[PDB]
CSV table of C-alpha atoms in Angstrom, one decimal:
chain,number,residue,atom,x,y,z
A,22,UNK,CA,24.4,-27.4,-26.3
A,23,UNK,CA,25.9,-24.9,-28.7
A,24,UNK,CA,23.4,-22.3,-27.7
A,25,UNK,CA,24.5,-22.6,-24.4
A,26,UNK,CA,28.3,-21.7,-25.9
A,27,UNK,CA,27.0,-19.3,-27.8
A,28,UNK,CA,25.3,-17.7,-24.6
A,29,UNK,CA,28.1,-18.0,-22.6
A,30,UNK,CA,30.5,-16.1,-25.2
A,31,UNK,CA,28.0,-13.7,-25.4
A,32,UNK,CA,28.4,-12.7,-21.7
A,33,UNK,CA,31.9,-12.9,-21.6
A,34,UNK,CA,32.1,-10.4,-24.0
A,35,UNK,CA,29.9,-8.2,-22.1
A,36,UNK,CA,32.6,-8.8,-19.6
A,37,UNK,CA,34.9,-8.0,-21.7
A,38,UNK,CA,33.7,-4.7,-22.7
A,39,UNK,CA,32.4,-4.2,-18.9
A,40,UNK,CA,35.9,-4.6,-17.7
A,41,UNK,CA,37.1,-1.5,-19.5
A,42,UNK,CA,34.3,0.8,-19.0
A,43,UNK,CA,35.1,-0.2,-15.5
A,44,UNK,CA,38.6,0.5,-15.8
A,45,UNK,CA,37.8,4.3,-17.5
A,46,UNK,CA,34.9,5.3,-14.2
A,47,UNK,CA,37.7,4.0,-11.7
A,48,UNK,CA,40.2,6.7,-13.6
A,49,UNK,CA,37.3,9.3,-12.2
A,50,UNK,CA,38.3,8.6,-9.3
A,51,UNK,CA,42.0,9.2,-8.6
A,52,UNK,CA,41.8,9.8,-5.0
A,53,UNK,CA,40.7,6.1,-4.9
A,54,UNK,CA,37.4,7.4,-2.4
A,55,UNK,CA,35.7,4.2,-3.8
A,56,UNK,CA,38.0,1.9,-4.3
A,57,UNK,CA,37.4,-0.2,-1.6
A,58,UNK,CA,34.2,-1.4,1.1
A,59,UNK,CA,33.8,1.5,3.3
A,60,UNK,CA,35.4,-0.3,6.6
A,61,UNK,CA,32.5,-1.1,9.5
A,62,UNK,CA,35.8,-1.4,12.1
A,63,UNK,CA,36.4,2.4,11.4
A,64,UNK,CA,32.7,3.2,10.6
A,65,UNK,CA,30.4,1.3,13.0
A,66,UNK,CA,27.0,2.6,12.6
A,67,UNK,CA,27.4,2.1,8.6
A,68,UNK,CA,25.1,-0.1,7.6
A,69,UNK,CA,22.3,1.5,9.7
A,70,UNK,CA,22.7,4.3,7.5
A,71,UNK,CA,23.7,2.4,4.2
A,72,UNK,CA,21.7,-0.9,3.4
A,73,UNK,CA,23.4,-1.7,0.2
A,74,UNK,CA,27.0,-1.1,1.0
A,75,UNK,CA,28.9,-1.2,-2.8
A,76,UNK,CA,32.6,0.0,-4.0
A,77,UNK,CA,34.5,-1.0,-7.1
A,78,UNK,CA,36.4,-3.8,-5.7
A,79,UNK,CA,33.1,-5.6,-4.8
A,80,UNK,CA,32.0,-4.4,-8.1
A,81,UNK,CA,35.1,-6.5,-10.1
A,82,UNK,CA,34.9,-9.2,-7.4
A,83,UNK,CA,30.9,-9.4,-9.0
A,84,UNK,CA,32.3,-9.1,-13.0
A,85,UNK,CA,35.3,-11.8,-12.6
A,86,UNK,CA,32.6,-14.1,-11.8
A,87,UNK,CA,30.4,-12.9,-14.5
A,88,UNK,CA,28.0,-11.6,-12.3
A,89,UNK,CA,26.4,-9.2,-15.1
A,90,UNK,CA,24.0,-10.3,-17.3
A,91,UNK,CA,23.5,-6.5,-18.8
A,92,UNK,CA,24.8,-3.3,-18.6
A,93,UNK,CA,21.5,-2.3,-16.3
A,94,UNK,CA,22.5,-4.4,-13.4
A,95,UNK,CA,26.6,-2.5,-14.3
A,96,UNK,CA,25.0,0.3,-13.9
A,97,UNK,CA,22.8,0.3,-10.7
A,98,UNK,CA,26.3,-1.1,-8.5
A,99,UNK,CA,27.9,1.7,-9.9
A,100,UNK,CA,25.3,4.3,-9.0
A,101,UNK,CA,24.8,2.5,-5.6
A,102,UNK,CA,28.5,3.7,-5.1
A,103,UNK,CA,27.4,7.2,-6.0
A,104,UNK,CA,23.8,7.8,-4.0
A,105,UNK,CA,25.9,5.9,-1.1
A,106,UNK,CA,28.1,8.5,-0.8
A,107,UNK,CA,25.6,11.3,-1.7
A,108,UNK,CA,23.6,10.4,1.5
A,109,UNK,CA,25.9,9.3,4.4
A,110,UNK,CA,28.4,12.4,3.7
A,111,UNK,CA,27.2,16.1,3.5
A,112,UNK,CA,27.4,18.3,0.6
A,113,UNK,CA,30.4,20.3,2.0
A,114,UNK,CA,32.3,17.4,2.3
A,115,UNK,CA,35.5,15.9,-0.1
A,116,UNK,CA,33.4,12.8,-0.1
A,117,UNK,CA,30.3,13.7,-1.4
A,118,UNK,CA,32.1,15.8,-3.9
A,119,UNK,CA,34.2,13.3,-5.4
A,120,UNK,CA,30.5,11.1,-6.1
A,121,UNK,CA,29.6,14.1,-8.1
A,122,UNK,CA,32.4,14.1,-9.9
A,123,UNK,CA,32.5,10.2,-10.4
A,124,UNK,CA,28.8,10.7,-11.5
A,125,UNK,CA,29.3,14.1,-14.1
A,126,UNK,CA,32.8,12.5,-15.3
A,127,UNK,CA,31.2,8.5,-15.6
A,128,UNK,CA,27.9,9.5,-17.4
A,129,UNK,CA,30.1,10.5,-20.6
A,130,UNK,CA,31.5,6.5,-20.5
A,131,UNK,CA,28.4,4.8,-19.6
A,132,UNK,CA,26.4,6.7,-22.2
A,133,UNK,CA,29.0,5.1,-24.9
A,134,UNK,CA,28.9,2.0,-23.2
A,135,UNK,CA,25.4,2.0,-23.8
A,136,UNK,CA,25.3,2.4,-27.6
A,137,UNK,CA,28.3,-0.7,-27.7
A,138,UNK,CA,26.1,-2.8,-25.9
A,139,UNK,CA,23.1,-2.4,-28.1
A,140,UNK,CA,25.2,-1.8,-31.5
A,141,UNK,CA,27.4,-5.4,-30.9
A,142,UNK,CA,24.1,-7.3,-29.3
């Protein structure tokens, strides 16, 4: 149908747009702490720590395929990467700060992200 186009330009926009705000939280992180799957052959006992296990190449892995309907479901991968790292590494800890950092520094983005999202439908 041509709704079904319609739909499906729709989200590839949102892909589209989602791509770059993507592009701009990754730049928070220069030391590249995120960038890929914490490795369970150098950290064993992960995932009995960690039940949702995310980074930002399983996060464009997710938005090549489309996998976001709406800047909500964006959102909650990229703040699993966040609280992630908040709880399996301690405060004192060049991990856990670079989260914080990733959080203060993203929040600007996401917040403009936000108002695009609602202002182009």
């Amino acid at each position: 149908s041509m709704e079904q186009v319609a739909m499906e330009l729709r989200l590839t926009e949102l892909t589209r747009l989602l791509r770059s705000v993507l592009d701009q939280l990754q730049d928070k992180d220069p030391a590249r702490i995120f960038a890929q799957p914490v490795s369970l052959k150098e950290v064993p006992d992960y995932l009995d720590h960690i039940k949702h296990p995310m980074d930002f190449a399983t996060m464009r892995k997710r938005l090549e395929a489309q996998g976001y309907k709406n800047l909500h479901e964006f959102e909650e991968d990229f703040d699993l990467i966040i609280d992630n790292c908040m709880k399996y590494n301690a405060r004192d800890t060049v991990f856990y700060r670079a989260a914080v950092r990733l959080r203060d520094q993203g929040g600007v983005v996401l917040r403009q992200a936000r108002r695009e999202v609602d202002s182009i439908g």
